[PDB]
From Swiss-Prot, chain A:
The modification Phosphothreonine is found at residue 114. This is Small ribosomal subunit protein eS4A. Present with 573 molecules/cell in log phase SD medium. There are 2 genes for eS4 in yeast. Component of the ribosome, a large ribonucleoprotein complex responsible for the synthesis of proteins in the cell. The small ribosomal subunit (SSU) binds messenger RNAs (mRNAs) and translates the encoded message by selecting cognate aminoacyl-transfer RNA (tRNA) molecules. The large subunit (LSU) contains the ribosomal catalytic site termed the peptidyl transferase center (PTC), which catalyzes the formation of peptide bonds, thereby polymerizing the amino acids delivered by tRNAs into a polypeptide chain. Pfam families: 40S_S4_C, KOW, Ribosomal_S4e, RS4NT, S4. GO terms for biological process: cytoplasmic translation; translation. It is found in: Cytoplasm. GO terms for cellular component: 90S preribosome; cytoplasm; cytosol; cytosolic small ribosomal subunit. Keywords: Cytoplasm, Isopeptide bond, Phosphoprotein, Ribonucleoprotein, Ribosomal protein, RNA-binding, rRNA-binding, Ubl conjugation. Residues 41-104 form the S4 RNA-binding domain. The modification Phosphoserine is found at residues 31, 246. There is a cross-link at residues 61, 133, 160, 167, 173, 178, 210, 232 (Glycyl lysine isopeptide (Lys-Gly) (interchain with G-Cter in ubiquitin)). CDD domains: KOW_RPS4 (cd06087), S4 (cd00165).
Swiss-Prot record, chain B:
GO terms for cellular component: 90S preribosome; cytosol; cytosolic small ribosomal subunit. It comes from the Eukaryota. GO terms for biological process: maturation of SSU-rRNA from tricistronic rRNA transcript (SSU-rRNA, 5.8S rRNA, LSU-rRNA); translation. This is Small ribosomal subunit protein eS8A. Gene3D superfamilies: 3.10.290.70, Ribosomal protein S8e, subdomain. GO terms for molecular function: structural constituent of ribosome. Residues 1-30 are annotated as: Disordered. It comes from Saccharomyces cerevisiae (strain ATCC 204508 / S288c). The modification Phosphoserine is found at residues 65, 68, 72, 85, 142-143, 146, 149.
Swiss-Prot record, chain C:
Belongs to the TRAFAC class translation factor GTPase superfamily. Bms1-like GTPase family. TSR1 subfamily. Interacts with RIO2. The chain holds residues 51 to 345 of 788 of the full protein. This is Ribosome biogenesis protein TSR1. It is found in: Cytoplasm; Nucleus, Nucleolus. Present with 1390 molecules/cell in log phase SD medium. Residues 32-198 form the Bms1-type G domain. Required for 40S ribosomal subunit synthesis. Required for normal export of the pre-40S particles from the nucleus to the cytoplasm. Its subcellular location and association with pre-40S subunitshifts from mixed cytoplasm/nucleus to all nuclear in RPS19 disruptions, suggesting it acts after the ribosomal protein.
UniProtKB/Swiss-Prot annotation, chain D:
This is Small ribosomal subunit protein uS4A. There is a cross-link at residue 179 (Glycyl lysine isopeptide (Lys-Gly) (interchain with G-Cter in ubiquitin)). The modification Phosphoserine is found at residue 183. The keyword Nucleotidyltransferase does not apply. The lineage of its organism: Eukaryota, Fungi, Dikarya, Ascomycota, Saccharomycotina. One of its GO terms (molecular function) is structural constituent of ribosome. It comes from the Eukaryota. NCBIfam families: PRK04051.1, uS4_arch. It comes from Saccharomyces cerevisiae (strain ATCC 204508 / S288c). Signal peptide: none annotated.
Length: 260, 188, 271, 185
RNA sequence: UAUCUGGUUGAUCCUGCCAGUAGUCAUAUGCUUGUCUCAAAGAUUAAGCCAUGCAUGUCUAAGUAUAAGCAAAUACAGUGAAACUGCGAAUGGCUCAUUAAAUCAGUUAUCGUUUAUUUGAUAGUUCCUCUACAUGGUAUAACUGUGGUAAUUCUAGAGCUAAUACAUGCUUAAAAUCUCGACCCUUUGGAAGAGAUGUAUUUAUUAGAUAAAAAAUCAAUGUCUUCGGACUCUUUGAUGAUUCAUAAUAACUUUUCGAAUCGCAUGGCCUUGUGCUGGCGAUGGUUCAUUCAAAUUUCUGCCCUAUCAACUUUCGAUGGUAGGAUAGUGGCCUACCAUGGUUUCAACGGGUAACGGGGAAUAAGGGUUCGAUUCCGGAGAGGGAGCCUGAGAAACGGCUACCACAUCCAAGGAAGGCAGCAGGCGCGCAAAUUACCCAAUCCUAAUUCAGGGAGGUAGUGACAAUAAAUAACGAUACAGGG
RNA sequence: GCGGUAAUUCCAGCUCCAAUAGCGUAUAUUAAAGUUGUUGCAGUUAAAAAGCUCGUAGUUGAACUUUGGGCCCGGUUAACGGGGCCUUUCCUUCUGGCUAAACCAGGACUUUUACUUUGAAAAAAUUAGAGUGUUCAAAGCAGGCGUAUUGCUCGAAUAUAUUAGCAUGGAAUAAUAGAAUAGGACG
RNA sequence: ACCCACUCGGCACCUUACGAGAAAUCAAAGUCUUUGGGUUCUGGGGGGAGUAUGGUCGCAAGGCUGAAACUUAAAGAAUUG
């Protein structure tokens, strides 16, 4: 329609934003950035609909222009900055650091992280190439292009950027037996180990994943993010440890922590 | 103006389509440039995305390449002798990509004298060692020597004049040269 | 489909062209006496305030300022709606002057007060008399609603009470406007400028002239000629027909000059 | 451009409108329980038919399907929390076996009749309407309140409403004023 | 959740249609009208015509300040009208006329392309075998003053002055490798000094290996042994797939880029020079990637019609070769050459009171009917066409031309586009205020500040939907069940 | 005054019934309708079997090819379903170890299909539905609890989407191909 | 050639109701509300009307295909008088 779109109505937003269908007829529409808009969380939604620190648009605006919210160690002053997966956004005025990660239900949940281990961020290296003037580089899921990688790092792997200038630390190879987290699809939010990977030339190699409670599932390779080996993942997992229990035992847990 | 969409032609079944919309812009076409022979006259054209296509309207002294020795010299262009697609461009001397043209000889023969030392159509002991090292490789086929004796070579333009301005090409060798001589002598 | 569309268009053009030669007959805009007379109905009411509210919403301060000093009949040209309004305020101490001003006018506007009730001896008789003597198009409007308590609920209670009063007196119109709100002032202005007046049968079948320049020239020591520059409306006048001037009587016309022809009364004069 | 607000009508007219038997039954119910018109009976019959359809199409489901177990437990739990089903009738054929009457009995108007305090069903309706009864603490004036079990024992007179003290009402106030001005001096 | 009943009925039975019954988030109309929550509303006829007003502007410490502007550091310095500059004006909002393999739906592809911005990376090579870089030059607006016109956001000649305006313009290391070679000293020959070596464009060529092991040959023949001649690691990434990414060589270019910008801070060094060096940013900039997108695209799916059976190719219909053009593939266009392509599994033609879908009403299931309309995708701004600017338009709250309406007059000329919000006329069975506000939701900008008829609030409002006041308790006297 | 009055009641009142802040009417559509019939109509006489036969596309089409038995183990409440072994029976495209062409550890594995199970990828709203006292309800996605002095905290599920495309288990049912000139397999 | 018994394939008949049907009646009009062996054709209350129009076949006569507006509550089987 004669140019790019700038508006986003309600009932066109992502469902995991948890926007009320009343109280206005428009949604933030995050501007361009590290992530696509369907898999992103703008700072306005994160600061007025999750933390309740703000109350409206102008209060989170006065938050941002006061230079208190930093995304990946950099001060960002856009209300619709698309903060997405494995961002390490911090509020230095109150001394908490936050990491964005999907909850067991599939929505972006608050997850408090310490002063240490907020100094890094994982990233699925998405495609590796050899740039102009012969230099080799990688680019990950959040648009970061890092020059001079380790030669063992191939397509669809995990690197560990710290904060400052790329400078890739110890990485993780992609093979069966590694702890893997899901960034898309019906099984969005489960954790588990690869028990097998199926290969289909032409399109969409699938992965068989078994979780900690012997509940296996299958997912496309685009939704696979390996976070470490067995027993010791390098990040702090969210609540519930990504299991996706069914409704009956969830109601049993409601009746278990009911009372007092 | 000029349209490139596939909505004003009939479908695969002979079905006549109807006008779905007006002529959009992102499918436009532009007027041809029948680039002639003369002094350099080039007009620039702004394109979709904000790029530029240097439309050459008149051009001479283009770049040409010898593949076997792999050299490239800026040389004048005497004119078109054969065009594979249309015949009227031969008569009006219009340049295109992949065109059989006649060019002048002299920069190539001065390079050959300075590089190999032998002569076509008929001191400095370091340069003597250079020629001795470059000896036993000075043999080229007969027709290029006959053209050098004539003073004009048959080359093929392999660059797009109306799309980048330059009129670059390569001089013919071997089976290509034989086929183009056969076609030129059979038709003309 | 295209034949259907052409049949629809041709029938529609037929219908519209049948409906055109009923309304097109009038002309205004550049010159028209569309006379508006302002009739107060409460003694504690200033019609100059009404005209101030009317002329304030055309963004023309200079015309009102020039109207402040000494004038009662006003020729105001509106460039917003491009209309030549002529505003007349009758003398409230001469009730017959009010009757004459309303019976010559095309539009009359009724000023109503929200604080003081309409007198049964002063305004109600005026309403009845103007209804009975022959009335053209009328608009009723409120001006002193700001003198009522500030909260809008009481003011709209007053407004609907006077709307009920007016619809007992004139049921054809139903909404009485507020000049405190600029919006209803603009509605009054567009109604006065654009809407065509209806006709009163007795006055439009014998013609009427509203005058601006009536001076005297000497012809004989016993009688002479008065000079009436005026706007003719209705049927027009003839040089031989008699003319009546209120509080003056009936007289014979002598000469007519048309400025926008010369007519002299011949031997067919009515005696 | 604002999202549409959803709504739904909560009653249904009978297909055969005019026959003696159920008209007799409805007028009997209105007489016994104090009903304004036939909308109340249609509303209870509509929600009862919805409940019975739910119980039925979970009953056609095969045994030990987790959906059948979960939704059946939820339906039985809500219908015992309201207080219509008895405690020892937590079965699907038993929730198929409901009537209009035991749904209408759990209303607040019938309950403020049954706990004393009203001495007549129409007195109960006009005195529940009139803002006199607090459930728990909150004053409610809806005859179709559908009293639960855990709030059954808290139906009391309001902190307002002179039946529970606190500054007697308007007619008594004006009668006291009249006897003060007349019989006082 | 699954009921029927009358009409042919004269006495009977079935076929059969009609009438009665119920529902409608389905439109209107008639009568009446107390309360609470909630809110659709000029779609059908006319995508018909429009008076008036608003609907798009924007400045931070961070482009330009001599306002004879308001206020209070001898270059300026607070705030700041106007104007140049930059960005937006291509989002929104409205409508459903066109559209019947077209849009659309789900599913793919771009190894066939464009992409302002956001985010991440990214520029020691520039004039040069006689030079401002402690900083090149022109104009012009705003402004002063003079005027023309009836009018318009009309403008002319005259004089001033700036840029992140327009136009030019050097810095910068060292090493290495090649072409030309003063040559000299006499050979298996080896050498002073001259040039070139960023990026971008275009062309030609080369590298981009890799299924496991054994000798004899010559030519280009390099290092080293012990000059017999021996010879070893030798370097190559991704993809299912590439003439891929990339590198190298020879050149080519009306040589594209490689900071003559701005704010806030006064740090360190000593040869103590108004020297050297140095921070935090904003704004730009080439190329690639990411992101917002865009454009073409594969598979399968549409309403009624045989009173539509053959259709497409003069004037491209189907394919091949080459060219033009495009951002790019492609009959998208041209030249040449073939004679093809679709069809009873219904092509082609016609109708649609047809935008498509998510959906809605009807509850035994299956189905029948509807979808102009709160979301998604398409098309259009009275009908066509063309186009400027720009990353993005065939834009219409931009232009040009014709066409149909139609406005102002000084009769010479000028201005127009409500299917945006209010509202008016008309057409009708059929549909609201020429109200208040940016406080909420969000958008645009130089950006917390300004703007937004986007949107919210209220008024009209029995579209539809929820809850339930118009009476309740005694005593008396009778009638009762007693 | 009575009775009759193609008065199709000619006009009004009393009483009663239904629904009720709503009720009726017109039109369109849906259900009851099995008067569109795939589920699910009918064709002697009620509408309706071509005058008759051949015949192309269309639809439909006889039977037959691994059965049966034994072994163990473990899963769910004596029953139910599962997997491997043997019984002439694991049949194919390739690496690394034990070896003397054949065992073990490993990627895939439909002659071409139809069918069917499971799964992925499937916008929100709407639909069904779990929780929660908007005073109830239609709704909304809130909320709930505390030293109510700098607090704690659950949750915003789930299900469906029959087509076309993608992956996967099965081989009954329904198709196709294989060696009759052996121009065939296996070393 | 005739007689007895059997069998295949026919044209027909008498009785019955295991069943069917509205009834007359039916060895099919049965295996049908407990509704599915395969497949062609035709009908949707009566008039208008096998009319009008179009196409096609035919020398002609005519044949094949074939609506609508409008209007109406109606239009097979037995017994009984």
């Amino acid at each position: 329609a004669r140019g790019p779109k700038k508006h986003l109505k309600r009932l066109a937003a992502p469902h995991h934003w948890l926007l009320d269908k009343l109280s206005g007829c428009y949604a933030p529409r995050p501007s361009a950035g590290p992530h696509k808009l369907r898999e992103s969380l703008p700072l306005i939604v994160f600061l007025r609909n999750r933390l309740k620190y703000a109350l409206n648009g102008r209060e989170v605006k006065a938050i941002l222009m006061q230079r208190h919210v930093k995304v990946d160690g950099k001060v960002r002053t856009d209300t619709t900055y698309p903060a997405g997966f494995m961002d390490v956004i911090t509020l230095d005025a109150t001394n908490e650091n936050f990491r964005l990660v999907y909850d067991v239900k599939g929505r972006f949940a608050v997850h408090r992280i310490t002063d240490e281990e907020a100094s890094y961020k994982l990233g699925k290296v998405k495609k590796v190439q050899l740039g102009k003037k012969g230099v080799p580089y990688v680019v990950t899921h959040d648009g970061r292009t890092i020059r001079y990688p380790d030669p063992n790092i191939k397509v669809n792997d995990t690197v560990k950027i710290d904060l400052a200038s790329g400078k890739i630390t110890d990485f993780i190879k992609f093979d069966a037996g590694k702890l893997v987290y899901v960034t898309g699809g019906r099984n969005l939010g489960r954790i588990g180990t690869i028990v097998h990977k199926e290969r289909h030339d032409g399109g969409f190699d699938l992965v068989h994943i078994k979780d900690s409670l012997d509940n296996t599932f299958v997912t496309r390779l685009n939704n696979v993010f390996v976070i470490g080996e067995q027993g010791k993942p390098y990040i702090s997992l969210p609540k519930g440890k990504g299991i996706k229990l069914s409704i009956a035992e969830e109601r049993d847990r409601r009746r278990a922590q009911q009372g007092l | 103006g000029i349209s490139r969409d596939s909505r004003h032609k009939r479908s695969a079944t002979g079905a006549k389509r109807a006008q779905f919309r007006k002529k959009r812009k992102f499918e436009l076409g532009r007027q041809p440039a029948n680039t002639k022979i003369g002094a350099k006259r080039i007009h620039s054209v702004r394109t979709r995305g904000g790029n530029k296509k240097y439309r050459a309207l008149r051009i001479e002294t283009g770049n040409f390449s010898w593949a076997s020795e792999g050299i490239s010299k800026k040389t004048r262009i005497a004119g078109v002798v054969y065009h594979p697609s249309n015949n009227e461009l031969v008569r009006t001397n219009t340049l295109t990509k992949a065109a059989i043209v006649q060019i002048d000889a002299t920069p190539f023969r001065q390079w050959f004298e300075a590089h190999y030392g032998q002569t076509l159509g008929k001191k400095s002991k370091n340069a003597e060692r250079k020629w001795a090292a470059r000896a036993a490789s000075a043999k080229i086929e007969s027709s290029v020597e006959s053209q050098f004796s004539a003073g004009r070579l048959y080359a093929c333009i392999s660059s797009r004049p109306g799309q980048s301005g330059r009129c670059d090409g390569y001089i013919l060798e071997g089976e290509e040269l034989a086929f183009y001589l056969r076609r030129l002598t059979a038709k003309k | 489909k295209l034949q259907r569309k052409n049949k629809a268009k041709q029938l529609r053009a037929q219908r519209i062209l049948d409906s055109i030669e009923n309304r097109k007959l009038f002309e205004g805009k550049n010159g028209a006496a569309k006379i508006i007379t302002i009739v107060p109905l409460v003694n504690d009411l200033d019609p100059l305030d009404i005209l101030y509210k009317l002329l304030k919403c055309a963004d023309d301060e200079g015309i009102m300022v020039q109207e402040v000093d000494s004038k009662r009949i006003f020729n105001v040209h509106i460039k917003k709606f491009k209309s030549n309004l002529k505003i007349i305020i009758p003398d409230m101490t001469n009730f017959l002057n009010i009757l004459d001003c309303a019976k010559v006018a095309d539009f009359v506007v009724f000023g109503l007060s929200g604080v003081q009730e309409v007198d049964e001896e002063f305004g109600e008789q005026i309403i009845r008399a103007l209804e009975l003597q022959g009335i053209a198009s009328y608009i009723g409007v409120i001006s002193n609603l700001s003198a009522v308590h500030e909260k809008e609920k009481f003011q709209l209670d007053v407004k609907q009470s006077l709307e009920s009063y007016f619809k007992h007196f004139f049921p054809s119109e139903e909404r009485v406007y507020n000049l405190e709100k600029n919006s209803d002032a603009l509605n009054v202005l567009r109604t006065l400028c654009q809407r065509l007046p209806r006709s009163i049968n007795w006055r439009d079948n014998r013609g009427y002239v509203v005058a601006d320049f009536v001076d005297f020239v000497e012809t004989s020591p016993d009688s002479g000629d008065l000079v009436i520059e005026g706007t003719v409306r209705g049927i027009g006048f003839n040089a031989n027909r008699l003319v009546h001037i209120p509080d003056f009587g009936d007289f014979q016309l002598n000469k007519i000059e048309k400025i926008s022809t010369v007519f002299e009364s011949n031997m067919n004069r009515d005696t | 451009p604002r999202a549409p607000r959803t709504y739904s009508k909560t009653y249904s007219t009978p297909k055969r409108p005019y026959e003696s038997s159920r008209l007799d039954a409805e007028l009997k119910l209105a007489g016994e329980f104090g009903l304004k018109n036939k909308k109340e009976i249609y509303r209870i019959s509509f929600q009862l038919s919805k409940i019975r359809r739910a119980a039925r199409d979970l009953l056609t489901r095969d045994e030990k399907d987790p959906k059948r177990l979960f939704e059946g437990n939820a339906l039985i739990r809500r219908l015992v929390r309201v207080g219509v089903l008895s405690e020892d009738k937590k079965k699907l054929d038993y929730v198929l076996a409901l009537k209009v009457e035991d749904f209408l009995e759990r209303r607040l108007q019938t309950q403020v009749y049954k706990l004393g305090l009203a001495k007549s069903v129409h007195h109960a309706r006009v005195l529940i309407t009139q803002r006199h009864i607090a459930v728990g603490k909150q004053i409610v004036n809806i005859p179709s309140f559908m009293v639960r079990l855990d709030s059954e024992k808290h139906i009391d007179f309001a902190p307002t409403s002179p039946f529970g003290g606190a500054r007697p009402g308007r007619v008594a106030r004006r009668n006291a004023a009249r006897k003060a001005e007349a019989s006082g001096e």
